[PDB]
Amino acid sequence: DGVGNASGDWHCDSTWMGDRVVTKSTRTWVLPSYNNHQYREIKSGSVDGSNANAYFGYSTPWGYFDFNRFHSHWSPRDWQRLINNYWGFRPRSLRVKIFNIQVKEVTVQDSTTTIANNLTSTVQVFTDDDYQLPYVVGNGTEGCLPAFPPQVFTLPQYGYATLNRDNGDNPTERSSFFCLEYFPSKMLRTGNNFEFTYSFEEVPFHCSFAPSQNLFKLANPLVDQYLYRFVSTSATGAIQFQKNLAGRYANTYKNWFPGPMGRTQGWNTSSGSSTNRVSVNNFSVSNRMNLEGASYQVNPQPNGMTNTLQGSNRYALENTMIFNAQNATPGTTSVYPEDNLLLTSESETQPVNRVAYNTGGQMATNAQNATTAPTVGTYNLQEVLPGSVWMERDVYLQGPIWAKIPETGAHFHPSPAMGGFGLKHPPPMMLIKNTPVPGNITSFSDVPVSSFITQYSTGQVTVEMEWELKKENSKRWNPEIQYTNNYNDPQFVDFAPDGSGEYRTTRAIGTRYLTRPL
Amino acid sequence: DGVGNASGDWHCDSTWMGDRVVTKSTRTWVLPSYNNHQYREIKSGSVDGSNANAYFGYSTPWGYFDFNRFHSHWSPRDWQRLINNYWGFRPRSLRVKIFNIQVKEVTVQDSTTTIANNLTSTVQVFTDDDYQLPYVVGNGTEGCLPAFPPQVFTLPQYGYATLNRDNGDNPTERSSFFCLEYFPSKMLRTGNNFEFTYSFEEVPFHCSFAPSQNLFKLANPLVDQYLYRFVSTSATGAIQFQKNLAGRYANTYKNWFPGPMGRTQGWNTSSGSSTNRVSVNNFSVSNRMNLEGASYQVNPQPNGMTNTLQGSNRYALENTMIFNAQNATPGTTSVYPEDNLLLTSESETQPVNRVAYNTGGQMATNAQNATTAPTVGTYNLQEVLPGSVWMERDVYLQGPIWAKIPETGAHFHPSPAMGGFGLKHPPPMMLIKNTPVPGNITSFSDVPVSSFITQYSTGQVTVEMEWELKKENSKRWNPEIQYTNNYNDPQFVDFAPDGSGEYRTTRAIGTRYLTRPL
Amino acid sequence: SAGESVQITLPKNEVQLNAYVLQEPPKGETYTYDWQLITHPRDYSGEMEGKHSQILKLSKLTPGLYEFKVIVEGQNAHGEGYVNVTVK
Amino acid sequence: SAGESVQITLPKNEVQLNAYVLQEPPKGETYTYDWQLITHPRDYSGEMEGKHSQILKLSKLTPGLYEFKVIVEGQNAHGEGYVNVTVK
């Protein structure tokens, strides 16, 4: 529209209206000119002695907007209002708007770097509505809209891995190259803006409640069962039985079973670090799955287990989501102690989910005879069974919202391991790049020009999300557990900027506070 | 319209809808100020000892848009979809749009070259709708829209040759000077755009199929002909005959004949380079035609021949289209081996077209008597004959689309030798130039000002083409040959950018894969 | 750049860190050091005294990892060092 | 500019190329060489090690023509050389 007219306003807000809540976030972004306007074939061989690290892909000159983290939409107080009062929620719609674009020309001379705006430069933007591009958004990576509204952020560079040959850095006949310029995109000069809208598919509500009953103790503790159980064999081999008494939950017949489990090693946090094995390199003794001839770690394991047992300091670390308390630099290889990190605990699900670091149980391992005694053996892993129930991983304020279900034609219970909503058609990738501007070209050449004017753009982005809420409807008499701002002798305010302006966050806030009977 | 408003979007796409396909390409161009806004008389005498190299012409300050190459419109995958599934295609319409123009002012001081935009500068654009200018677009020259969408390209400078005297660098009384400013053109400042539309004349479909029958073996191999042939003369001179038997194709009467041929030398590619004559300079022993007192090479010869014989490594190089695997610099005189180039093979047409490096046949060369024996002599060249059939040259992904038929009032079978569609009224030349901006002129002078501010412009160009397709309609039972992405132990992806960002292409992709009986 | 790492334990925590740079300039030319705490324990409150000096003083250091980045620049000569501090 | 051309045959292919420029500067002034492969066989995959150095190392060289363009510049003195490599 115009150089001296704003193409949009600043909208950050939450509006609660019954069973709906609309969140609005606006952030300032900055887009670098990645790769110098070129596509590059990126590849890697075996790194750290693991050929599962090998890949073949492409880095593109495009950047992308990632809105896949709860804190990009929810302030800590609104999150508290959500988890203390509702049984569940789910995304309904999304509206994105990119505006107030500013393209800057950078010029370095002799020890001098000036910056001036280029009023005629454009920025290109498109959304991948048909999912024709490798969707890299739901894999727990950096670059999402920052939690704290005033924080300015750089858009991450779009890249992808395709097929590599024999766990090496070579491509195969099936490796695919995708050209992002081969999509129709809108071009924006300083007065133009871009708007996009999207609606989520019917997805089940995330469960924001913990069970107030144990799965194996659902029977009335005052009445016996009209069922009998084999208890022994007489001195002559006659089978003997007894009635299952009231309250003896170790013996009652069960109708339902706990979800699938796969044993993972348990480690003690600090209080119990003296009981941990010393100097052990976890990779060699970790849970791994094989695929195409290589072994990959599979944290945080499939859903169905609890990583800790409420009241203990032992964690099944590979079944745990681990966040940094602060934003880290790219490529850091420092070894962090637990004092800098935020460990998540899924102990609220222990009345239903089995403990990840213990054996799942025991089964018969032979045929009993008058000469051979009955034998049992414990099992470390057990997959899904008919009539089994479990609770999915909880969502966190600083964790992912959705994940795209891989299109293969066959899947089971499409719920991403890192938590969130599994979607067949998630919010489309929104790509953006600075349109190239050639330097001073005087003569002709059939070779593509390589000399460009260095630029970078900036602007604002606003994301509006409507969420549907599930009202709590309990008849519990006594008070419930609530997430509360409880600190003893605070030296600073959590979820607030400190003296240096840095946003501080000392806790990973889950969703499970309210209870429900089974 | 405005400085801060984009005058167009980015459209790159292909849309298949039945018997039609619409291709859209957008590229970024850069236009240098050629000649410093002046027209120059360019001329040359005899170069490399050949006066066919002499010419007299004009270089203009204009540049031009060339869209005459298939890869400027077709991605490699769309081309594969085209050649594996259709029997033919042809251009129907064209729409061109030039937008987002940016004029840059260049200023060099003391060891410093700054670049700033000039918001008031214009660019001039016009199309030669009536074909009043020398059409230089369909002669296999550089400067077309690049194959890979993200590649920025420089527009080539418009120039032409007119008549020269006695194969020298002097003009004749008939030499014509054409002033491009003597045409009405649109002037564009940064907010303006230019659009042009055009429709192709009814042209025959290009044939994207190879014959699955040989021209001389069209007769049923199970039935004899009711025709007899002269086989000999008795010991007393009586002529003798025999019936033409079933399957003896060397003797059957024919109804049709192969197209015209003109013998060209054959050379062996690498596998057979030890059988090639050594150290031979091809110019002296090449196929040449004379015109106006000078001899010119006439590659790739007229249509009607096959340059190779499927199953051999010998090529009739002068009857072959040879492309570079990559874009080359202007004026390079390096001697390339076949390892850097892409040789095209027309062997699919061998069941119908005669082999370019063999003799065409033999005919009687005397009058037989009781004293003189019948004599025959082979012929190296043979032009068109009634009842002859042949296949035109195939089109390539990296080759020309059309050629303008020279207006002389008399021509035969207007099909360009380099392949493509022969047009009487092809897409008009689209010329563009940077409008001159005088430097600081203080006093008056009747002499045209020579001091100008140095500028260059850039923008985007989008070309939309509609193609008409001819559906394949075969009853062949067994599978057909298809173009396929087949490489053994690939070190990189063909038709993809490599590690340095360079677009790689290791193969010239033709059009002949499907078969048809004659 | 360098990467010096230090370590401390027990209750004591207050510590000071100096800054060493190669190609030392003349007395007439002094650099303006600058320290940035890029990593620290989630519990860290502490204070940084003398950031623009050669010695950065740290107090109230709780157990964990601390990452500093001292940048030493002058007349046509930019530089910077890295230091890791681990408290048990 | 110059135009040195080299040639090699047999299976061996890995080769290194140096850079020579006239008007050599003092020890205190070193140039920042830059090599660009402007021409190579359509089959070439290879790698270029030490582009910004005086010696550019080449490996996995398949038969064909290779055109390089080494540009040597310094304080008020731009230059460049050309080299052709032919593998049989």
Coordinates of N, CA and C in Angstrom, one line a residue, chain B residues 174-323:
Chain B
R174 N 22.4 -2.0 -50.2 CA 21.2 -2.6 -49.6 C 21.2 -2.9 -48.1
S175 N 22.4 -2.6 -47.5 CA 22.5 -2.8 -46.1 C 21.5 -2.0 -45.3
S176 N 20.8 -2.5 -44.4 CA 19.8 -1.7 -43.7 C 20.1 -1.5 -42.2
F177 N 19.9 -0.3 -41.8 CA 20.0 0.1 -40.4 C 18.6 0.2 -39.8
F178 N 18.4 -0.5 -38.7 CA 17.2 -0.4 -38.0 C 17.4 0.3 -36.7
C179 N 16.6 1.3 -36.4 CA 16.7 2.1 -35.2 C 15.6 1.6 -34.3
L180 N 15.9 1.0 -33.1 CA 14.9 0.5 -32.2 C 14.2 1.5 -31.5
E181 N 14.7 2.8 -31.4 CA 14.0 3.9 -30.8 C 12.8 4.3 -31.7
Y182 N 12.8 3.9 -32.9 CA 11.8 4.3 -33.9 C 10.6 3.4 -33.8
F183 N 10.4 2.8 -32.6 CA 9.2 2.0 -32.3 C 8.6 2.5 -31.1
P184 N 7.2 2.4 -30.9 CA 6.7 2.9 -29.7 C 6.9 1.9 -28.5
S185 N 7.4 2.4 -27.4 CA 7.7 1.5 -26.3 C 7.1 2.0 -25.0
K186 N 6.8 1.1 -24.1 CA 6.3 1.5 -22.8 C 7.4 1.8 -21.9
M187 N 7.3 2.9 -21.1 CA 8.3 3.2 -20.1 C 7.9 2.9 -18.7
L188 N 8.8 2.2 -18.0 CA 8.5 1.8 -16.7 C 9.4 2.3 -15.6
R189 N 8.7 2.8 -14.5 CA 9.5 3.3 -13.3 C 9.3 2.1 -12.4
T190 N 9.9 2.1 -11.2 CA 9.7 1.0 -10.2 C 8.3 0.5 -9.9
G191 N 7.3 1.2 -10.0 CA 6.0 0.7 -9.7 C 5.2 0.1 -10.9
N192 N 5.7 0.3 -12.1 CA 5.0 -0.2 -13.3 C 5.4 -1.6 -13.7
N193 N 4.5 -2.2 -14.5 CA 4.8 -3.5 -15.0 C 4.3 -3.6 -16.5
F194 N 4.8 -4.6 -17.2 CA 4.4 -4.8 -18.6 C 3.9 -6.2 -18.9
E195 N 2.8 -6.3 -19.6 CA 2.2 -7.6 -19.9 C 2.0 -7.7 -21.4
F196 N 2.2 -9.0 -21.9 CA 2.1 -9.3 -23.3 C 1.5 -10.6 -23.5
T197 N 0.6 -10.8 -24.5 CA 0.0 -12.1 -24.7 C 0.1 -12.4 -26.2
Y198 N 0.2 -13.7 -26.5 CA 0.3 -14.2 -27.9 C -0.2 -15.6 -28.1
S199 N -0.8 -15.9 -29.3 CA -1.2 -17.2 -29.6 C -0.5 -17.8 -30.8
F200 N -0.1 -19.1 -30.7 CA 0.6 -19.7 -31.8 C -0.4 -20.1 -33.0
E201 N 0.2 -20.2 -34.2 CA -0.6 -20.5 -35.3 C -0.8 -22.0 -35.3
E202 N -1.8 -22.6 -36.0 CA -2.0 -24.0 -36.1 C -0.7 -24.6 -36.6
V203 N 0.0 -25.4 -35.8 CA 1.3 -26.0 -36.2 C 1.1 -27.5 -36.0
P204 N 1.7 -28.4 -36.8 CA 1.5 -29.8 -36.5 C 2.2 -30.3 -35.2
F205 N 1.7 -31.3 -34.6 CA 2.2 -31.9 -33.4 C 3.6 -32.4 -33.6
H206 N 4.5 -32.3 -32.6 CA 5.8 -32.9 -32.7 C 5.5 -34.3 -32.4
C207 N 6.2 -35.2 -33.1 CA 6.0 -36.7 -32.8 C 6.9 -37.2 -31.8
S208 N 6.3 -37.6 -30.6 CA 7.1 -38.2 -29.5 C 7.0 -39.7 -29.5
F209 N 7.2 -40.3 -30.6 CA 7.2 -41.8 -30.6 C 8.1 -42.3 -31.7
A210 N 8.6 -43.5 -31.4 CA 9.6 -44.2 -32.3 C 8.7 -45.2 -33.0
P211 N 9.1 -45.5 -34.3 CA 8.4 -46.6 -35.0 C 8.7 -48.0 -34.5
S212 N 7.7 -48.8 -34.4 CA 8.0 -50.2 -33.9 C 8.0 -51.2 -35.1
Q213 N 8.1 -50.6 -36.3 CA 8.2 -51.4 -37.5 C 9.2 -50.7 -38.5
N214 N 9.8 -51.5 -39.3 CA 10.8 -51.0 -40.2 C 10.1 -50.7 -41.5
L215 N 10.4 -49.5 -42.1 CA 9.7 -49.1 -43.4 C 9.7 -50.1 -44.5
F216 N 10.8 -50.9 -44.7 CA 10.9 -51.9 -45.7 C 10.4 -53.3 -45.4
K217 N 9.8 -53.4 -44.2 CA 9.3 -54.7 -43.8 C 7.8 -54.6 -43.3
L218 N 7.0 -53.9 -44.1 CA 5.6 -53.7 -43.7 C 4.7 -54.8 -44.2
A219 N 5.2 -55.6 -45.1 CA 4.4 -56.7 -45.7 C 4.3 -57.9 -44.7
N220 N 3.2 -58.5 -44.7 CA 2.9 -59.7 -43.9 C 4.0 -60.8 -44.2
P221 N 4.8 -61.2 -43.2 CA 5.8 -62.2 -43.4 C 5.4 -63.6 -43.7
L222 N 4.1 -63.8 -43.7 CA 3.5 -65.2 -43.9 C 2.9 -65.3 -45.3
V223 N 2.7 -64.2 -46.0 CA 2.1 -64.3 -47.3 C 3.0 -63.8 -48.4
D224 N 3.1 -64.4 -49.6 CA 3.9 -63.9 -50.7 C 3.2 -62.8 -51.4
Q225 N 3.9 -62.1 -52.3 CA 3.3 -61.0 -53.0 C 2.9 -61.6 -54.4
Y226 N 1.8 -61.1 -55.0 CA 1.4 -61.6 -56.3 C 2.2 -60.9 -57.4
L227 N 3.4 -60.5 -57.0 CA 4.3 -59.8 -57.9 C 5.6 -60.5 -58.2
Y228 N 6.1 -60.4 -59.4 CA 7.3 -61.1 -59.8 C 8.4 -60.1 -60.0
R229 N 9.7 -60.6 -59.9 CA 10.8 -59.7 -60.1 C 11.8 -60.3 -61.1
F230 N 12.5 -59.4 -61.8 CA 13.5 -59.8 -62.7 C 14.7 -60.3 -61.9
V231 N 15.1 -61.5 -62.2 CA 16.2 -62.1 -61.4 C 17.5 -62.4 -62.2
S232 N 17.3 -62.6 -63.5 CA 18.5 -62.9 -64.3 C 18.1 -63.0 -65.8
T233 N 19.1 -63.4 -66.6 CA 18.9 -63.6 -68.0 C 19.5 -64.9 -68.3
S234 N 18.8 -65.7 -69.2 CA 19.3 -67.0 -69.5 C 20.6 -67.0 -70.3
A235 N 21.1 -68.1 -70.7 CA 22.3 -68.2 -71.5 C 22.1 -67.8 -72.9
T236 N 20.9 -67.3 -73.2 CA 20.6 -66.8 -74.6 C 20.1 -65.4 -74.5
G237 N 20.1 -64.8 -73.3 CA 19.6 -63.5 -73.1 C 18.2 -63.3 -72.8
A238 N 17.4 -64.4 -72.6 CA 16.0 -64.3 -72.2 C 15.9 -63.8 -70.8
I239 N 15.1 -62.8 -70.5 CA 14.9 -62.3 -69.2 C 14.1 -63.3 -68.4
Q240 N 14.5 -63.5 -67.1 CA 13.8 -64.5 -66.2 C 13.3 -63.9 -65.0
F241 N 12.2 -64.4 -64.5 CA 11.5 -63.9 -63.3 C 11.2 -64.9 -62.2
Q242 N 11.0 -64.4 -61.0 CA 10.6 -65.3 -59.8 C 9.6 -64.5 -59.0
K243 N 8.8 -65.2 -58.3 CA 7.8 -64.6 -57.4 C 8.4 -64.1 -56.1
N244 N 8.0 -63.0 -55.6 CA 8.5 -62.5 -54.3 C 7.9 -63.2 -53.2
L245 N 8.7 -64.1 -52.5 CA 8.2 -64.9 -51.4 C 7.9 -64.2 -50.1
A246 N 7.2 -64.9 -49.2 CA 6.8 -64.4 -47.9 C 8.0 -64.2 -47.0
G247 N 8.1 -63.0 -46.4 CA 9.2 -62.7 -45.5 C 10.6 -62.3 -46.1
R248 N 10.7 -62.4 -47.5 CA 12.0 -62.0 -48.1 C 11.9 -60.5 -48.4
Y249 N 12.1 -59.7 -47.4 CA 12.0 -58.3 -47.5 C 13.0 -57.6 -48.4
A250 N 14.1 -58.3 -48.7 CA 15.1 -57.8 -49.6 C 14.5 -57.6 -51.0
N251 N 13.5 -58.4 -51.3 CA 12.9 -58.5 -52.6 C 11.5 -58.0 -52.8
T252 N 10.8 -57.7 -51.8 CA 9.4 -57.3 -51.9 C 9.3 -55.9 -52.6
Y253 N 8.2 -55.7 -53.3 CA 8.0 -54.4 -54.0 C 7.6 -53.5 -52.8
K254 N 8.1 -52.3 -52.9 CA 7.9 -51.3 -51.8 C 6.9 -50.2 -52.3
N255 N 6.2 -49.6 -51.4 CA 5.2 -48.6 -51.7 C 5.8 -47.2 -51.3
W256 N 6.7 -47.3 -50.3 CA 7.2 -46.1 -49.7 C 8.8 -46.1 -49.6
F257 N 9.3 -44.9 -49.6 CA 10.8 -44.8 -49.5 C 11.3 -43.9 -48.4
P258 N 12.5 -44.1 -47.9 CA 13.1 -43.3 -46.9 C 13.3 -41.9 -47.3
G259 N 13.4 -41.0 -46.4 CA 13.6 -39.6 -46.7 C 14.9 -39.3 -47.3
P260 N 15.2 -38.0 -47.6 CA 16.5 -37.6 -48.2 C 17.7 -37.7 -47.3
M261 N 18.8 -38.0 -47.9 CA 20.1 -38.1 -47.2 C 21.2 -37.4 -47.9
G262 N 22.2 -37.1 -47.1 CA 23.4 -36.5 -47.6 C 24.5 -37.0 -46.7
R263 N 25.3 -37.9 -47.2 CA 26.4 -38.5 -46.5 C 27.3 -37.5 -45.7
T264 N 27.6 -37.9 -44.4 CA 28.4 -37.1 -43.6 C 29.4 -38.1 -43.0
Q265 N 30.6 -37.6 -42.6 CA 31.6 -38.5 -42.1 C 31.2 -39.1 -40.7
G266 N 31.6 -40.4 -40.4 CA 31.3 -41.0 -39.2 C 32.6 -41.1 -38.3
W267 N 32.4 -40.9 -37.0 CA 33.5 -41.0 -36.1 C 33.1 -41.8 -34.8
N268 N 34.1 -42.5 -34.3 CA 33.8 -43.3 -33.2 C 34.0 -42.6 -31.9
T269 N 33.0 -42.7 -31.0 CA 33.2 -42.2 -29.7 C 34.4 -42.9 -29.0
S270 N 34.6 -42.7 -27.7 CA 35.8 -43.2 -27.0 C 36.1 -44.7 -27.1
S271 N 35.1 -45.6 -26.9 CA 35.3 -47.0 -26.9 C 36.0 -47.4 -28.2
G272 N 35.7 -46.7 -29.3 CA 36.4 -47.0 -30.6 C 37.2 -45.9 -31.1
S273 N 37.9 -45.1 -30.3 CA 38.7 -44.0 -30.7 C 40.1 -44.5 -31.4
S274 N 40.4 -45.7 -31.2 CA 41.6 -46.3 -31.8 C 41.5 -46.6 -33.3
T275 N 40.2 -46.6 -33.7 CA 39.9 -46.8 -35.1 C 39.6 -45.5 -35.9
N276 N 39.8 -44.4 -35.2 CA 39.6 -43.1 -35.8 C 40.9 -42.7 -36.5
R277 N 40.8 -41.9 -37.5 CA 42.0 -41.4 -38.2 C 42.5 -40.4 -37.2
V278 N 43.8 -40.3 -37.0 CA 44.4 -39.4 -36.1 C 44.8 -38.0 -36.6
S279 N 44.8 -37.0 -35.8 CA 45.2 -35.6 -36.1 C 44.6 -35.1 -37.4
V280 N 43.3 -35.1 -37.5 CA 42.6 -34.5 -38.7 C 41.8 -33.3 -38.3
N281 N 42.0 -32.2 -39.1 CA 41.3 -31.0 -38.9 C 40.0 -31.1 -39.8
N282 N 38.9 -31.2 -39.1 CA 37.6 -31.3 -39.7 C 37.1 -30.3 -40.7
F283 N 37.4 -29.0 -40.5 CA 36.9 -28.0 -41.4 C 37.1 -28.3 -42.9
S284 N 38.4 -28.6 -43.2 CA 38.7 -28.9 -44.6 C 37.9 -30.1 -45.2
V285 N 37.6 -31.0 -44.4 CA 36.8 -32.2 -44.9 C 35.4 -32.3 -44.4
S286 N 34.7 -31.2 -44.2 CA 33.4 -31.2 -43.7 C 32.4 -30.9 -44.8
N287 N 31.1 -31.2 -44.4 CA 30.0 -30.9 -45.4 C 29.8 -29.4 -45.4
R288 N 29.8 -28.8 -46.6 CA 29.6 -27.4 -46.7 C 28.8 -27.0 -47.9
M289 N 28.1 -25.9 -47.7 CA 27.2 -25.3 -48.8 C 27.8 -24.0 -49.1
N290 N 27.7 -23.6 -50.4 CA 28.2 -22.3 -50.9 C 27.1 -21.3 -51.0
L291 N 27.4 -20.1 -50.7 CA 26.4 -19.0 -50.8 C 27.1 -17.7 -50.9
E292 N 26.8 -17.0 -51.9 CA 27.4 -15.7 -52.2 C 28.9 -15.7 -52.3
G293 N 29.5 -16.8 -52.8 CA 30.9 -16.8 -52.9 C 31.7 -17.4 -51.7
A294 N 31.0 -17.8 -50.7 CA 31.7 -18.4 -49.5 C 31.1 -19.7 -49.1
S295 N 31.9 -20.5 -48.4 CA 31.5 -21.8 -48.0 C 31.2 -21.9 -46.4
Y296 N 30.0 -22.3 -46.1 CA 29.6 -22.4 -44.7 C 29.4 -23.9 -44.3
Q297 N 29.7 -24.2 -43.0 CA 29.4 -25.6 -42.6 C 27.8 -25.5 -42.4
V298 N 27.1 -26.6 -42.6 CA 25.7 -26.6 -42.4 C 25.1 -27.6 -41.4
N299 N 25.8 -27.7 -40.3 CA 25.3 -28.6 -39.2 C 24.0 -28.0 -38.7
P300 N 23.0 -28.9 -38.3 CA 23.2 -30.3 -38.2 C 22.6 -31.1 -39.5
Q301 N 22.7 -30.4 -40.6 CA 22.2 -31.0 -41.9 C 20.7 -31.0 -42.0
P302 N 20.1 -31.2 -43.2 CA 18.7 -31.2 -43.2 C 18.1 -32.5 -42.6
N303 N 16.8 -32.4 -42.2 CA 16.1 -33.5 -41.7 C 16.0 -34.7 -42.6
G304 N 15.8 -35.9 -42.0 CA 15.7 -37.1 -42.9 C 16.7 -38.2 -42.6
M305 N 17.7 -38.0 -41.7 CA 18.7 -39.0 -41.4 C 18.8 -39.3 -40.0
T306 N 19.4 -40.4 -39.6 CA 19.7 -40.7 -38.3 C 21.2 -40.6 -38.2
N307 N 21.7 -40.0 -37.1 CA 23.2 -39.8 -37.0 C 23.9 -41.0 -36.4
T308 N 23.2 -41.9 -35.9 CA 23.9 -43.1 -35.3 C 23.1 -44.4 -35.6
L309 N 23.7 -45.5 -35.5 CA 23.1 -46.8 -35.7 C 23.0 -47.6 -34.4
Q310 N 21.9 -47.5 -33.7 CA 21.7 -48.2 -32.4 C 22.5 -49.5 -32.3
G311 N 23.4 -49.5 -31.3 CA 24.3 -50.6 -31.1 C 25.7 -50.4 -31.5
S312 N 26.0 -49.2 -32.0 CA 27.3 -48.9 -32.4 C 27.8 -47.6 -31.7
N313 N 29.1 -47.3 -31.8 CA 29.7 -46.2 -31.2 C 30.1 -45.1 -32.2
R314 N 29.7 -45.3 -33.5 CA 30.1 -44.4 -34.5 C 29.0 -43.3 -34.7
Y315 N 29.4 -42.1 -34.7 CA 28.5 -41.0 -34.9 C 28.8 -40.1 -36.1
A316 N 27.7 -39.6 -36.7 CA 27.9 -38.7 -37.9 C 27.8 -37.4 -37.1
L317 N 28.9 -37.0 -36.6 CA 29.0 -35.7 -35.7 C 28.4 -34.5 -36.3
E318 N 28.4 -34.3 -37.6 CA 27.9 -33.1 -38.2 C 26.4 -33.1 -38.3
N319 N 25.8 -34.3 -38.1 CA 24.4 -34.5 -38.1 C 23.9 -34.6 -36.6
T320 N 24.7 -34.2 -35.7 CA 24.4 -34.3 -34.3 C 24.3 -33.0 -33.5
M321 N 23.3 -32.9 -32.6 CA 23.2 -31.7 -31.8 C 24.1 -31.9 -30.6
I322 N 25.0 -31.0 -30.3 CA 26.0 -31.2 -29.2 C 25.8 -30.1 -28.2
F323 N 25.5 -30.4 -27.0 CA 25.3 -29.5 -25.9 C 26.4 -29.6 -24.8

